[PDB]
Each structure stands twice: as C-alpha cells, then as structure tokens.
Amino acid sequence: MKTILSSETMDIPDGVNIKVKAKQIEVEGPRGKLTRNFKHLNLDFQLIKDEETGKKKLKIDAWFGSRKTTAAIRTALSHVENLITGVTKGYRYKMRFVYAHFPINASISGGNKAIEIRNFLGEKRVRKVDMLEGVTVVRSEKVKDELVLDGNDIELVSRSAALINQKCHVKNKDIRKFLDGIYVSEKGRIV
Amino acid sequence: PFKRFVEIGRVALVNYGKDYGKLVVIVDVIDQNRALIDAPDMVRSQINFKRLSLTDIKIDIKRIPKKKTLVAAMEAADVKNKWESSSWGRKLIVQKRRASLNDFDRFKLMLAKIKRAGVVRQELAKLKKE
Amino acid sequence: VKGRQGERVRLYVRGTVLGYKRSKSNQYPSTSLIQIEGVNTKEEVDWYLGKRMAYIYKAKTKKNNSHYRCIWGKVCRPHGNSGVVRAKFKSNLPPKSMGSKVRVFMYPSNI
Amino acid sequence: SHRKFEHPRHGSLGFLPRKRAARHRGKVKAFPKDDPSKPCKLTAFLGYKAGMTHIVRDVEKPGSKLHKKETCEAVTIIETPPMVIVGVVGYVKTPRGLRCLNTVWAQHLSEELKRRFYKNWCKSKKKAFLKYSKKYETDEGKKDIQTQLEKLKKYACVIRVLAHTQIRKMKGLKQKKAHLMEIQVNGGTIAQKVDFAYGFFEKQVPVDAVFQKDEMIDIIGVTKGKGYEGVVTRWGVTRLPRK
Amino acid sequence: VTYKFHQYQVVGRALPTENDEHPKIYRMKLWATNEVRAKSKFWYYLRKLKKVKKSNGQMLAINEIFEKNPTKIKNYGIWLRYQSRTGYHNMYKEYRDTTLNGAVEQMYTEMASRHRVRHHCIQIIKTATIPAKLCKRESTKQFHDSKIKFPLVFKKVRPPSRKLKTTYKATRPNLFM
Amino acid sequence: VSGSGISARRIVVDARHHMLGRLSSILAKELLNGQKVVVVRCEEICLSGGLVRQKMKYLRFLRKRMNTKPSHGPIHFRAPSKILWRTIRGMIPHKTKRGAAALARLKVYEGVPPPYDKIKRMVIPDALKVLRLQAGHKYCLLGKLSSEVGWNHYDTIKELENKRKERAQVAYERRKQLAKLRVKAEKAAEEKLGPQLAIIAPIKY
RNA sequence: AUUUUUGGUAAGCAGAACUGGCGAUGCGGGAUGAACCGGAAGCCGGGUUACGGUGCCAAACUGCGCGCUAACCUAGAUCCCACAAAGGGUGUUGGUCGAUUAAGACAGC
RNA sequence: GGCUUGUGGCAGCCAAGCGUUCAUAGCGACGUUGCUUUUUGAUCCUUCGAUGUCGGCUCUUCCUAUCAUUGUGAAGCAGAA
RNA sequence: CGCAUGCGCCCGCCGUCCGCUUGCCGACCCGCAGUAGGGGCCUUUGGCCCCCAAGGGCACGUGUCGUUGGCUAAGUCAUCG
Ligand SMILES: [K+]
Ligand SMILES: [K+]
Numbered sequence A: 001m002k003t004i005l006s007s008e009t010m011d012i013p014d015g016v017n018i019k020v021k022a023k024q025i026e027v028e029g030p031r032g033k034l035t036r037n038f039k040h041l042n043l044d045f046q047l048i049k050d051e052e053t054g055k056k057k058l059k060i061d062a063w064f065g066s067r068k069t070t071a072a073i074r075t076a077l078s079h080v081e082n083l084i085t086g087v088t089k090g091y092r093y094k095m096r097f098v099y100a101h102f103p104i105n106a107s108i109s110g111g112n113k114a115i116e117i118r119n120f121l122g123e124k125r126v127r128k129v130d131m132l133e134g135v136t137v138v139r140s141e142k143v144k145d146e147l148v149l150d151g152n153d154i155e156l157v158s159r160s161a162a163l164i165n166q167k168c169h170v171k172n173k174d175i176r177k178f179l180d181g182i183y184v185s186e187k188g189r190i191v
Numbered sequence B: 001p002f003k004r005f006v007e008i009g010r011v012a013l014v015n016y017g018k019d020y021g022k023l024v025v026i027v028d029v030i031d032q033n034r035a036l037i038d039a040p041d042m043v044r045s046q047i048n049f050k051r052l053s054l055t056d057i058k059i060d061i062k063r064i065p066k067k068k069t070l071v072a073a074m075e076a077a078d079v080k081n082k083w084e085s086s087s088w089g090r091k092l093i094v095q096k097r098r099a100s101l102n103d104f105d106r107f108k109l110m111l112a113k114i115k116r117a118g119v120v121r122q123e124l125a126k127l128k129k130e
Numbered sequence C: 001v002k003g004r005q006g007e008r009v010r011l012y013v014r015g016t017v018l019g020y021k022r023s024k025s026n027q028y029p030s031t032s033l034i035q036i037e038g039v040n041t042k043e044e045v046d047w048y049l050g051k052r053m054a055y056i057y058k059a060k061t062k063k064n065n066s067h068y069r070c071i072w073g074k075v076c077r078p079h080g081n082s083g084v085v086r087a088k089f090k091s092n093l094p095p096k097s098m099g100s101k102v103r104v105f106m107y108p109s110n111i
Numbered sequence D: 001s002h003r004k005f006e007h008p009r010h011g012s013l014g015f016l017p018r019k020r021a022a023r024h025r026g027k028v029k030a031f032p033k034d035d036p037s038k039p040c041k042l043t044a045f046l047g048y049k050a051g052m053t054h055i056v057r058d059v060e061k062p063g064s065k066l067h068k069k070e071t072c073e074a075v076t077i078i079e080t081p082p083m084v085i086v087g088v089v090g091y092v093k094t095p096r097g098l099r100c101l102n103t104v105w106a107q108h109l110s111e112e113l114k115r116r117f118y119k120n121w122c123k124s125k126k127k128a129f130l131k132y133s134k135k136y137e138t139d140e141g142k143k144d145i146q147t148q149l150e151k152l153k154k155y156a157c158v159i160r161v162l163a164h165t166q167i168r169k170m171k172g173l174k175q176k177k178a179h180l181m182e183i184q185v186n187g188g189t190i191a192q193k194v195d196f197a198y199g200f201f202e203k204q205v206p207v208d209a210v211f212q213k214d215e216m217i218d219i220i221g222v223t224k225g226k227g228y229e230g231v232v233t234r235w236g237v238t239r240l241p242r243k
Numbered sequence E: 001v002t003y004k005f006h007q008y009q010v011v012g013r014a015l016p017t018e019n020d021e022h023p024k025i026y027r028m029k030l031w032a033t034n035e036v037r038a039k040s041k042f043w044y045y046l047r048k049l050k051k052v053k054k055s056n057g058q059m060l061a062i063n064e065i066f067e068k069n070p071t072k073i074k075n076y077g078i079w080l081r082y083q084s085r086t087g088y089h090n091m092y093k094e095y096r097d098t099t100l101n102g103a104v105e106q107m108y109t110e111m112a113s114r115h116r117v118r119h120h121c122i123q124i125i126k127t128a129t130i131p132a133k134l135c136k137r138e139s140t141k142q143f144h145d146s147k148i149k150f151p152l153v154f155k156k157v158r159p160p161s162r163k164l165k166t167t168y169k170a171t172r173p174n175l176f177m
Numbered sequence F: 001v002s003g004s005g006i007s008a009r010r011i012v013v014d015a016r017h018h019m020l021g022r023l024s025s026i027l028a029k030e031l032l033n034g035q036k037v038v039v040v041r042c043e044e045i046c047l048s049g050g051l052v053r054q055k056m057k058y059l060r061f062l063r064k065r066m067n068t069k070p071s072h073g074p075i076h077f078r079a080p081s082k083i084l085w086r087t088i089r090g091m092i093p094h095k096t097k098r099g100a101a102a103l104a105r106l107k108v109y110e111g112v113p114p115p116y117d118k119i120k121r122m123v124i125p126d127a128l129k130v131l132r133l134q135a136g137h138k139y140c141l142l143g144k145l146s147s148e149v150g151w152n153h154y155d156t157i158k159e160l161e162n163k164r165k166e167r168a169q170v171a172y173e174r175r176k177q178l179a180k181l182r183v184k185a186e187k188a189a190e191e192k193l194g195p196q197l198a199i200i201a202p203i204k205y
Numbered sequence G: 001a002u003u004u005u006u007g008g009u010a011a012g013c014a015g016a017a018c019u020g021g022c023g024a025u026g027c028g029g030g031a032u033g034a035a036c037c038g039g040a041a042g043c044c045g046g047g048u049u050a051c052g053g054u055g056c057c058a059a060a061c062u063g064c065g066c067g068c069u070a071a072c073c074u075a076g077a078u079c080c081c082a083c084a085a086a087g088g089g090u091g092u093u094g095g096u097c098g099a100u101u102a103a104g105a106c107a108g109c
Numbered sequence H: 001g002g003c004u005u006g007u008g009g010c011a012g013c014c015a016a017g018c019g020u021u022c023a024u025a026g027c028g029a030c031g032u033u034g035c036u037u038u039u040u041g042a043u044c045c046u047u048c049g050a051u052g053u054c055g056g057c058u059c060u061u062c063c064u065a066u067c068a069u070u071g072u073g074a075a076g077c078a079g080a081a
Numbered sequence I: 001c002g003c004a005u006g007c008g009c010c011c012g013c014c015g016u017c018c019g020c021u022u023g024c025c026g027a028c029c030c031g032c033a034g035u036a037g038g039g040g041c042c043u044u045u046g047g048c049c050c051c052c053a054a055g056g057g058c059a060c061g062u063g064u065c066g067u068u069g070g071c072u073a074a075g076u077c078a079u080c081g
C-alpha cells in the first residue's frame, strides 16, 4: 500500500572507513578493501557523522515503497555488515571429506589458489577447482581430511566452497547410501 | 540527498494548468497524490502533486492556518522577493518580458546586442592576441 | 558575416502538406491538411484563420519567363488539437505535394 | 501420412548450391587466429597437384594392432616452388568488418606476375605498373612509399603480403600466367608485420618457411568437374525398379 | 467546482387512498450524477424495500447536500455492498478528501480498479465522517502526522502547455529530488 | 503524433536510452511528413521486458522462414541499426512509393561515425527511458541483444566510441577555456558600453 | 439473428412460434466476412453526428486523472468471433469472521 | 476438406482402498473436469459439362502425446536391473 | 590497386546555355554520464550557490536577393596558397 517511509540504520565501527557515492559502497579496513555496487536498488543511502562523538551510521530508506521494494533495505544492510565483517575479521569456511572406501586425495596447487581431487569413489578422472579472487584454500593439519577456505568476501568464499562441493557429486547411485563428497561443515571468521 | 520535501509551509510553483507560474504554500497533505494549497490571492484548495514544482523556500506555519497568519508568515519569510531574486524565479519573469516586448523595443534591443557583441569580439580578440 | 545570397526579408511562415482530409478508407482531396511551423494548438490556429497561402513549385516549361508556378489557397479552420489546419486551394493540391512546403503569409491582416 | 520407413536423407544441405565455383583458385575463407607473442610468419602457400603414389612405414602407436607393424598408405605429391613476394596489403577494423586501406607494390614485377593482369598479354602493350615503378626513382617517390608504409603500420589491424607463384618453373604446366594470392602474416606487432613484409619484397619464400614435416594442414581447391549430372550420381538416391 | 457524483435527499410517499389518508413519508440519501438518476434510484429502493412503486407513488422533495467546509480535509468511511462474479459481499472503506463527493468518486474508482465492479453493481449502505483517532485503515492513518514529510518520488516532466511542446530537445531532462 | 513541423535540412538523433517502439513511431511519422533523420548510437537503444523476453521474441522471429526457399525471406538482421530500420519499416507503408521515399529519407548507424561526431545531436523526450520506464522495471540494451543473437561488432563499437569520447572531452575542455576567456573579455568590455547594458539588463536571464 | 422451443452427446445438424434482416442493398464500423453495430442512397458545397476510434501503419491526445498486473508459458489487449474447464499458488492487492498481546503477542538465545 | 466428438485415443481432480504397517514410492474404486482429430460415427456446406478411386515402392519435410541417445529429480533406488 | 585509346580522352580557370534534386530563404550550434542525482566556489568533518528542458545561445539580423562614388584602425565571414 506504498508505506510513506521505510528506514533502517546500522552503526559502523570506528576501525572501518566507508564511502558512499551513487549507491557505490566502498569499505576499507585492516584486512584490505571491499567494493559493492548497489545501483540496482532504488533506495536512498546516507552516511550520518556524529560531530560531538565522531561515530558513523549508515541509513538506508525507501519512500512510498511496496513490501517487495522494502524487503531490500535489510538485504542491503546485511550485505554492508558482511562487508565490514570481511574487512575486519575475515571469513573462514571449513569443509570435510566424506568417503566410505576410497580416501579422497586432495592436492593444493601453488599459491593455495587451486585444488585437485583425484580418488573420489575410486575415479581415474582428476577434478580441478580454482579459488575465486581473494580466497585461499589450505589443507588443515589439526583436523583429518579438512579444507580451510579463507577470504575477505563472504560471497566469494562461499561460492568457492560450493564449487568444491558440487565438483564431487555422486551419479548413477543412491546418494542416500553413497554419501561420498566434500561438504561445508563450519562457517566463521578467520580471527 | 533529497534537497526538497513536501511539508507544511513548503512553497511550491504551479507548473501546469491555468494557474501556471503561481506560488502556493502547502498547508496540508490529503494523500500521496494531492495536497492542500493556499495563497493570499486564492481559496485554499486541493491540487495534485504532478502540477507542483517544489522550491527551496519554506515558511514556519501550522497546518491549515488562517489567511492572516499565512500572509504574515509569507511576508516575514519574504517569499516573493526571494523567489523573484532567485535565478529560477527570474526565469519566468524574463520569459514574460521577452514575450511582452514590442517591435520598436525589439529593434532597440537588437541594436544594443549587436553593439555589445562587436565590442566583446574586439575585446576577446585583443585578449587572445595578448 | 554570413555572406548569403537570397531573400532579404521573410514575411511568411512555412507549412508542411500532410495530406488530405480523410477517413480510414475514404479521401477528400478538396481539403488539404497543413502543419504550420511554430503552431502547436488549435487556440494558436485562431491567428492564422483566413490567412493566405501559396504553394510554389517548378515546372519543366517556362511560363512568363519563369519555371515557377503558384497555386493560391487559404486556411479555413483548425484540424484536431495539435495545431494542424484545414486549407482550401483554388485547385486540389496534387498528391506529389505531400511533404512539401507552402508559404503562409501574414495577410489579410486583422491588426 | 508418415513415411513407411526411416532412413537418413541423401546428401548434405551444407554444400548448397551445387553450382560451379566462382573461382578456379582455392580461396582462404578464414585465416588462423593471430597471436602477437610469436615471430612474424606466413599462414598459407600455393602448390600444384602432381600425382599420387603409395608408401610403406612402421607404425608407432601403442595399443593399436598396427604397433611396430608395417602399413601401406596412399600419398599425394604437391609441387611447391618458392613464392615471390611482390606487395603488402593492410586492413582496418571497422563496424562493417575489415576494410582494405592501401596496397604497396614492389618496384620490380616479373612478366609471369604481370601476365595475371591481362587477358591477352601478347597482343597488349604491356603497360601494367610502368608508371608505378617510377615511384622508386624520384626522391619524392620513395618518400611517398615510406609514408604509405608508415600509414599502414599506424592504422592497419591485420597485414597480408601479396605473393605469386613461379609457374614457368613447372614446364609440365603449359601456363605462363602466375597465380597471385594474399597470405596473412601472423605474429608480432603491426609495425613488425609491415617490416617483415617489406623486407621480403622481390624475394622468395620457400614452403618450409610456412610448413614442416608431420604438420597437419588444410587443402583448399576446386573439385574435379563432371558437368550435367542426374540425381542418382549427383546426390546418391537409389535406383527405381527395372520396370 | 464540479462534482461527478452529487448527494441528494429524496423524499417521497405512496399515493393517498381511502384506507391511508396520510401514508408514511420515506426519505433517502442517495448518490447519482443527476437528480433524475437520484429519483430513479430512490424509486427502485422504495419498490424493493417498501412495496411502493413509482406508478402508485408520489415524489415530495429532492434537495442537494453540499459539504459544509470544502476547504478542509476530512476522513470519510463508507459501508457498501457490492456484487462480484459469484455473489454479494459487504465492504467498509476509508478515504481522505475535502468533500464526501470526492470520497465517493474515489470509492467508485477503487471498486472498479480492484474488484472490477461496475457502478450499477454497488449499493451504498452508510457514509460517515470519521475522526482521525477512529480511523481503521492504515492507508488513511499514515497521513495522520503532525509533521508529515516526504519527497516527490515520481513527477512527470512536461511543458506548462502544449504551446511549448517540441519533438526534439538539445539536452536530456535534468531531474533531481 | 501530428509531427514536429520544423523546417530543417536534416535532424541527427542520439538514440541512447530511447524506447525502441516509441522512437520508431515518432521517427516514422517524421519520415512520412518528409523530414530527413539520421539516428546514431543505435546499439544504446533500450527495450522493455528484459533481455530474456527480448531474446525469446527474437528467436521466435528467427523461426520464421519460407519452408521451400529460406532465401526468399523473412530476412533476420542482427545489427542494432538494421533492427531499428526494420522496426521503423514495420510502421510505414513501405510497399507504396510514399513509404519507400519515407524509408529512403532515413539513415541508421551504430556508434557515431563521421561527420556526425561533430554535429549537434538531439533527443526525443517522448521516447526517453528516464521518462517512459519506471526505475526497477526490466529492460535490455539493443546492442546486448544483437550481440547475443549474433552481432560480432560490439567490441569494435565500444573501442571507437571510447576514442571518440576522449577526443570530445579534449574539445570540451578547449571550449570551456574559450568560454572563460569570453567571460573575462565581457567583464573587460562592461565599462565601455553603459546604455546598451542598461537596455539589455531587463532581458538577461 | 435476439427471445420462446422439439429430436439429437453435439454439429456451420434437423424441425417449429413472433418479429426483424440477407435474398433483391449499396454506404461507415467489426483488419478480413450475406446476416453483427450504425445507417439505408438522386448530382454537389458547407456544418454536425451514429457505431467505432484518437503510438505509427491511419484522420483524431504518446491529453488530464486513480488503482491493478510484471507473465524466466508467445503476459494482455473489445458483442457475433473465431474456445478453455475442474482443481491449485506462502505472487500480489483489497475485504469478512475469529484468536494472542505493555499484569509484555510469535522465532532464537 | 469444414462443424461436432457420441465412439476411439490421450490427460487431470477428490481419496475408499492396494501396496509386510503407509491414501498419494508406484496405483486409483465410487464419482467428476478436460484435451485431440492418426478411429469410427453424425451431417450434406464445396465438387456429378469428372479434383484419377486400395496398398506397396521412392523422396522430402513437419509434429510430440520421447522408443533409443545427451543432462537431470524421485523410488518399496545396497549393486545390477 | 594497375592500365586507361593521337581528328580522342582527362584536369584547372573564364563567359554562356541546358537538365536532375529527397521539396533553400539565418536552410547557424560536437561534452560525458545520471535521473533514489550532477556541477561550481569556499575547503570544518563543513557551508553557500546552480539545475527544475535549445523555453538557450550565436549571428549587420537593419540595404529593391539588397542605388552611385571614396576612405577603411580593429573585429568577423568568405575565397586562394
Ligand atoms: K507415407
Ligand atoms: K534401388
């Protein structure tokens, strides 16, 4: 029914710099740089500075927006929160190898930017996966048959994990019985 | 962002219809499409927002004020003089004057413009040569 | 500044010949539809109501030491709302004049 | 009603129309993709079918029944005398495709090449390129040629050399009219391509400068003509009953 | 000031007879584009609800009702019953307008737009002026703000009149809120 | 749409961010009325409904072909300029001499080729996306659709347009410097002519 | 052909009642059409309409207004008319009747 | 060939039951809504100063309500089938 | 891109004549991007100003397509190198 004003605000930690211009959000922190293009959202983004204190707030609002349009405000705020988390703490995904008979042989290429899977269900084919930008994959030493993906972009890290998982799908078998694969087991922050 | 909002006391310009060129004050809001407007030389009435162009002028008034109160607020804010002095307001006045010019006045203006253009061209050529 | 060679004074406006008064399936060439440059409303047509018009064109042969030919006409009434006018000429305009320019003069004058 | 039984259609619709080719010499329709990180090299060549023979060789193919066994294979002989380079052509990239910008010819052209520009060479006065050659004699002329080459370097996107065969060397052919063709130069920058083309003016390029042993190549040409033909032989349709 | 819909008070009765020398007088508040149509609807309702036909009836009075203060905004509540493609239903709606005539026009337009109900398929049961605190619909309650403030999100660009309209423009329109 | 009614030798239109159908209708009326139109930057034309819908529509169009002789038409052009030309022909009686002349009075180009790179280019408000399409609704670029359906010159157009825009930026900077010099010269000349400035004052914006 | 109406699953089937129409009749509209809508006609000028329309084709607004729809099935687009049903949707938009709630409503801690 | 679709053929909805227990893995009684014109009927609009009347052979193209082949979801899918 | 005809052909200037024209009459005008923004000044993190259509700007624009003679700084337009 076109609610007049739907607004939501988020606090910004003092250790992160943020710039907004034409719905282009630039985030800077100790771990590096992140960028997002929110041009596809018909929302108004504003950065409020507290002169007396010096703190930062990001306010996103929609005017005369329907429910569908208003649903994007929280999405944008969560995306900005994820950017801040990635630039301050970073993102770490953990994957575990699951197999019944054939151990999965994983080889990490140079730079921790590519992975080779060789013995999935005793298959002679070699599966190649390349990590996305800013995401590095390593083989854990404290946990058996575990892969650690570290990055600054939650979306890129999760997409790399999804690529690894989907590259090892079982076919022509009852997947309920043949549970072999590589699956995401934990999501968290590097620090 | 959003330098202008529709508000109680906001001065708008009628940009369409028989009342084009007139300043009105938004004294109330009926709904998302129309608002209640007033002014010294009309009867308070509803108008669609599509026929209004918001200005940068705003007066301090309560909703649906009396005619005398509205006039006093407008005079205190000096809405007329500010609008006339602003480039946006001066545009309509200049268009009206240009339309109102007559044949002899247009000839005199043409002579003045030709002389000014000649002098400006001489000055610019000398400036370039310097 | 320009150095042009042509008419030194213009005392007329231009009018594009749109066609004839017509329905979807019928045509009446006795009346012509003319769009006058700068006229955008039937209210503005009131000034030009009754003004003389000339359709100038060239012929292969010479008449009175000239290839020019002229068919005179005048504005009768407005057509539609967008400024188009209905016009009547001494003879029906040829269909080949469609898209061509006629001269709308300032006479007969009412001011 | 549907056809009673199914079989694949006779012939291919991808070679339509089955008309006489508009040319006698094979035309290169697409040149190899150019990689600028390689030395300048010609992409094509012209040869002449001589005949066929057969060879025997020992096959090295592990897993095959022919491994370490003799095999007899038919081969074709193509005579490929060195091609003489006589010019350079440059093209500019445009929204409408490649547009020829300018052509620069060498000072000296052989009679075999000049024969390609006449229908009756003997009856003519043989005036081809006579005024063009004089551009290499007047100082302004070589300057103009160098300026044309510089413009080609500046604006061209793909470079092709003009090369003609030394047909009279093969007396078995009764032809003195050489075959001329454009051969693309792949590798290097545009300036490198232009310099490589210019350095080969009035010079021979052997076949081994383009192709080498064990290389896979493509052969373009006009098939043997057979004239008017019925459907049975032209398309492979089956014969109707005797009666 | 022209309203498409006008409010009429229509007063009528049955023709006096020997049995009833002074028959009961009935009054109705009706909405119609004209007094003729108002009287027609009055007679329809009288026939349907009181067994009094126009032929054996008498028309005593008909008067227009105008808004007391068309200069001020009011909240209007309308109770109506309408016919859909599969039955009849009751419906209460709220509007904001300077006049109940404008409110009724809005009601007719909204019924047509949202339910594909034609004018003749709508019967108005009740109309009232609702105070701000008693309004039930968010559409009207969201404008009950002492400090109402919002920008003009959607504005159509056009010249003051077609006199200044031109097919071609040297530059694209410059728009900013 | 009666027609523009202007008297000009030709009109150059920058079709960037113009709705295809509305621009085509307006230009068809102009051509029928007898105007000469040159459309540039056809690859920047906007189509409502989105890339998916427009691509399915173009595939449906590509399905059409004379079964016994596909060379007999319909002819499916891929370039944005040809698409605009065919769309305009769809709104013109092109099978008559009048329609043929109206079509012949039309030129369509991709990008801004010469000499139109140095000629003033106009826009049609009635077909502008900013005025006709609500922000958020789906639309696609005609160039993108053409590239998807088999146009292989988008990159060349992009490169040439970038070069042209750089040159135009240089020219604009030069013009801005010239304008500043002209303003300073006007300031210098202000004192010379008093009465003329007095006469011009009530008319200056 | 509207309405009434018989046989037949039904039919652009077959048969009856009243009136009108086509046949014998052009003309404007329904793209196109014997029956539909309008309307019936000597040869012309001017004015205005009927049905139907006013983005182009194509004469008349991209006219002034309010809502709904987003169709990744060829979204949809005007009596006859050139078809679509029962069942469904946590797509979205209004209404009706109920239940909990600042002695603090629902989900996670 | 045209209207229709009873008949023929091909689908859907509800859920009493079947399926070691469990309506819906796989089916669907009693009922009920549709689609199609490769069945056969019904009709008689076109053709009787004539449209060559079965089937086969040859040849092309088109449809999907998909037999096989490519990629997938589900199972009363351990594997195989 | 080559070559282009010995009462021939081609190019440039001057006088005259004819024919075609997509319709001369000031037939003047190159920024990009965006429209939930853009730009300038001042630079406090900041403040002020502009937009809100070429609805503008330019142009002896002034003389029978424009009378007779002479001078002519600067400016501008045209033609030729
Ligand atoms: K068959
Ligand atoms: K056979």
Ligand SMILES: [K+]
Residues within 6 Å of the ligand: H005
């Ligand atoms: K059936």
Ligand SMILES: [K+]
Residues within 6 Å of the ligand: H044
């Ligand atoms: K029959």
Ligand SMILES: [K+]
Residues within 6 Å of the ligand: H047, H048, H050
């Ligand atoms: K017969």
Ligand SMILES: [K+]
Residues within 6 Å of the ligand: H056
């Ligand atoms: K057989």
Ligand SMILES: [K+]
Residues within 6 Å of the ligand: I060
């Ligand atoms: K002059």
Ligand SMILES: [Mg+2]
Residues within 6 Å of the ligand: D002, D003, D006
């Ligand atoms: Mg078959």
Ligand SMILES: [Mg+2]
Residues within 6 Å of the ligand: G037
């Ligand atoms: Mg009738």
Ligand SMILES: [Mg+2]
Residues within 6 Å of the ligand: none
């Ligand atoms: Mg008449």
Ligand SMILES: [Mg+2]
Residues within 6 Å of the ligand: H022
């Ligand atoms: Mg079960």
Ligand SMILES: [Mg+2]
Residues within 6 Å of the ligand: H064
């Ligand atoms: Mg299927």
